[PDB]
Nucleic acid binder design. Structure first.
Ligand SMILES: [Mg+2]
Lengths: 210, 346, 211
DNA sequence: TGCATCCGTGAGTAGA
DNA sequence: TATAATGGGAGCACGGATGCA
């Protein structure tokens, strides 16, 4: 009934009262120190549904990744607005990124073993330990690393470099390590003798990155 | 301006889940309920109470209300007591609390995600006597039942299991609320069955079936009388405001008399009845006439048993009845001479 | 972990885990608080700056927010949010009407009555008439909101049997039926912990039923 | 200050 | 109580009073 009596008392227009009573917009009964768009929440302020959800429950967004693609950022990493979350995905807001349903679990298994390598005295640079990518030796000339034991070759190839395990019968008689710059001259399941070249190490050879 | 459009807009604010999300929420819900059972085994409290407290903390300060099922009233003081009672548990026992919380949250998100299905199911049920939004709400109840009863172990999409409960709820609603005079659900099923049967019969025969033909197509146990009584009991009342003329001038309810309240003629009839009955009752000895009135409740408005009506004036038993008749004998005298009582006998 | 034990993935030996190719990525505005030992808050709790989160009170919250406890990632994450009380409908309106001090508003409007602008004096008058009406009458504004809806006596909304043995009734019975049904459904929905959307819609329907 | 919006009015009796 | 199903459908005339541009 115009003018609205309730609307008149609370100083609200017809539209506002309609929106509040009929569950269009929210009316603030207390700020609790809320801030919206840089200006603090005033009591008796009309909030939309989006505004109320953002204020009360916070702001977040989910970005779908095309199946078969990997993320350019890690899990739990702080993200800036405009920073690409993927090759085809751009994040609209700032905050913490979280992985939703990883389709692939890559487990890196820790392996600590004992291997051996035969090298010329001159080429080898003496060091108590060797970091990945650090030069193990520098060769003046092509050099072949021969087998010191007879047996069956087991070739285990990593990303770069390899482990060659020689075994007679069911018991391994030898374990050899071939660093970067060393090309295996044998294949998997090959029979070799003492003094037969296993691999050729030429030029400057260093520890693999892995 | 339009409630349905507004609700449909509020529905489109929640994005639909995916398979992994659905299975995730379902898993969190089930493991949440299991966690509640675990906390029940540990703390020694009521599973319902714990569930309602966890739910109270999830929903927040916005909603607190007493549940009819709980033995104790639910108030923020109590929810704080029980919450702090749950947080006092060791880490391994405190894990189930977090599990239950995330479980309830997952339940809320799961129900909120499926709200479209309820609408798509309820849109087919329009015209049964219930409003669209009513059907949507009952269907929402069905969806809630579905969420609480769902098992992700069976590798079934949630829509499959939910649809059944939604249809169930919608149907129960339609059967329950559509009639001004309430009829039980089974009887409603019977009436609907009768309707479909009669519709098939008129469909094949090319004319409106009789009670006998309906009795035949209904099988054994059904005769014409039962069909007639069932159709009679299936009749819906009509509105008193139903238009009579060509204008808004008159209503149906203006043509219905009130049979309850006594007309002035009836009131005067009863009054004069008491008058003439008091006129001819003083003609003879007082105590026996007053014993007659004592039996017929003119005095106290109650029929007194022979021992009581006896014990009234100091007599007892067998005499009293023989006096009443005696009174009724002498009562046959006076009136018969003045003949005043004829017309009141109708 | 999976449904069937044979499809589960169990680590053969010692190693580190790396998650790749996620279904999606969820960006949230929040604060991450990794905890080593034990957390004193649970999911759903609300937290102001300076409140103890985990580790016996070593790690606390920087900002206002809602608590999400991640057991998998072993971190207490606080989503930035406020405790704001913002309501809808006749509940909120009734609250506002209850909070009103009529004498104060009368004073304010009286001060407004001295403004040089004609329109402002007009509006101030129109409001002050209502305010003073409530003041003189002794009526409270919050009574314009109904907690309890009266029911008209059945003889003024009769269910009667006509000549033919059929029934005639008043439409007020149907309206009352709608109101009662929606109210009961609302109460059940509240007791069963329905989501905000459902309850909201139900309340709207209730309001329109009373309408 | 004037244009424009919503809202609320529009004979009686009889009969049907 | 279990394939999956996920956003509806209809439908003149002049006045006072207030709201807005
Ligand atoms: Mg039969």
């Amino acid at each position: 009934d115009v003018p609205s009596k309730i609307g008149t008392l609370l100083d609200l227009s017809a539209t506002e009262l309609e929106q509040v009573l009929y569950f269009s917009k929210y009316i603030v009964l207390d700020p609790k120190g809320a801030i919206l768009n840089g200006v603090p929440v005033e009591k008796r302020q009309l909030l939309t549904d989006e505004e109320y959800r953002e204020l009360r429950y916070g702001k977040q967004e989910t970005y779908p990744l095309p199946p078969g693609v990997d993320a350019l950022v890690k899990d739990g990493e702080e993200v800036v607005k405009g920073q690409e979350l993927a090759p085809g995905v751009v994040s609209r807001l700032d905050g913490v990124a979280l992985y939703r349903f990883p389709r692939r679990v890559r487990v890196e298994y820790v392996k600590k073993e004992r291997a051996g390598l035969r090298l010329p005295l001159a080429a080898w640079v003496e060091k108590e330990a060797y970091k990945p990518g650090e030069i193990l030796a520098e060769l003046p000339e092509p050099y072949l690393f021969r087998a010191e034991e007879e047996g069956v070759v087991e070739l285990k190839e990593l990303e770069e470099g390899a482990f060659l395990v020689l075994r007679r019968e069911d018991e391994p008689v030898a374990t050899y390590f071939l660093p970067v710059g060393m090309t295996p001259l044998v294949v998997h399941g090959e029979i070799v003798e003492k003094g037969q070249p296993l691999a050729e190490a030429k030029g400057l050879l260093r520890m693999p990155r892995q | 301006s339009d409630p349905v459009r507004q609700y449909l807009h509020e529905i489109g604010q929640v994005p639909l889940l995916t398979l992994e999300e659905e299975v995730e929420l379902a898993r969190k819900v089930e493991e949440g309920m299991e966690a509640i059972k675990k906390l029940s085994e540990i703390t020694g409290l009521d599973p319902d109470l714990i569930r309602e407290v966890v739910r109270a903390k999830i929903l927040g300060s916005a909603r607190v209300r007493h549940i009819p099922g709980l033995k104790e009233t639910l108030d923020p003081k109590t929810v704080e007591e029980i919450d702090q009672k749950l947080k006092s548990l060791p880490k391994e026992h405190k894990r189930y609390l977090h599990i239950a919380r995330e479980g309830e949250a997952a339940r809320q998100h799961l129900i909120e995600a499926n709200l479209r299905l309820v609408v798509s199911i309820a849109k087919k049920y329009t015209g049964r006597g219930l409003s669209f939004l009513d059907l949507i709400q009952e269907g929402n109840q069905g969806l809630i039942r579905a969420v609480e009863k769902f098992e992700y172990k069976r590798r079934f999409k949630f829509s499959t299991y939910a649809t059944w409960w939604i249809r169930q709820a919608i149907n129960r609603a339609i059967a329950d609320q559509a009639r001004t005079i309430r009829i039980p659900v089974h009887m409603v099923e019977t009436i609907n069955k009768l309707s479909r049967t009669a519709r098939q019969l008129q469909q094949e025969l090319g004319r409106e079936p009789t009670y006998e033909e309906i009795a035949e197509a209904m099988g054994p146990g059904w005769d014409a009388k039962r069909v007639e009584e069932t159709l009679k009991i299936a009749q819906e009342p009509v509105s008193l405001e139903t238009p009579i003329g060509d204008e808004k001038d008159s209503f149906y309810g203006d043509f219905i008399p009130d049979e309850h309240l006594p007309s002035p003629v009836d009131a005067a009839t009863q009054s004069l009845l008491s008058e003439e009955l008091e006129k001819a009752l003083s003609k003879l000895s007082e105590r026996e006439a007053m014993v007659l009135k004592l039996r017929k409740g003119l005095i106290d408005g109650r029929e007194h048993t022979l021992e009581e009506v006896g014990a009234f004036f100091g007599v007892t038993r067998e005499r009293i009845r023989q006096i009443e008749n005696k009174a009724l004998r002498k009562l046959k005298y006076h009136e018969s001479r003045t003949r005043k009582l004829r017309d009141f006998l109708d | 972990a999976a449904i069937d034990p044979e499809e589960e993935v169990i680590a053969e030996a010692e190693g580190v885990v790396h998650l790749h190719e996620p279904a999606s990525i969820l960006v949230v505005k929040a604060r991450v608080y990794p905890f080593e030992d034990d957390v004193e808050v649970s999911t759903g709790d609300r937290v102001a700056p300076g409140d103890v989160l985990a580790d016996g009170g070593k790690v606390k919250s920087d900002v206002y927010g809602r608590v999400e406890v991640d057991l998998v990632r072993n971190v207490v994450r606080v989503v930035e949010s406020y405790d704001i009380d913002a309501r809808m409908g006749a509940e909120a309106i009734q609250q506002l009407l209850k909070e009103l001090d009529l004498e104060a508003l009368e004073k304010e409007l009286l001060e407004e009555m001295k403004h040089p602008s004609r329109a402002r004096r007009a509006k101030a008058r129109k409001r002050l008439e209502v305010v003073r009406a409530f003041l003189d009458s002794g009526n409270r504004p919050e009574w314009m909101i109904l907690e309890a809806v009266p029911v008209l006596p059945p003889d003024l909304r009769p269910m009667v049997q006509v000549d033919g043995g059929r029934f005639a009734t008043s439409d007020l019975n149907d309206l009352y039926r709608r109101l009662i049904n929606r109210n009961n459904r609302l109460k059940k929905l509240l007791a069963q912990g329905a989501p905000e959307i459902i309850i909201r819609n139900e309340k709207r329907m209730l309001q329109e039923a009373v309408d």
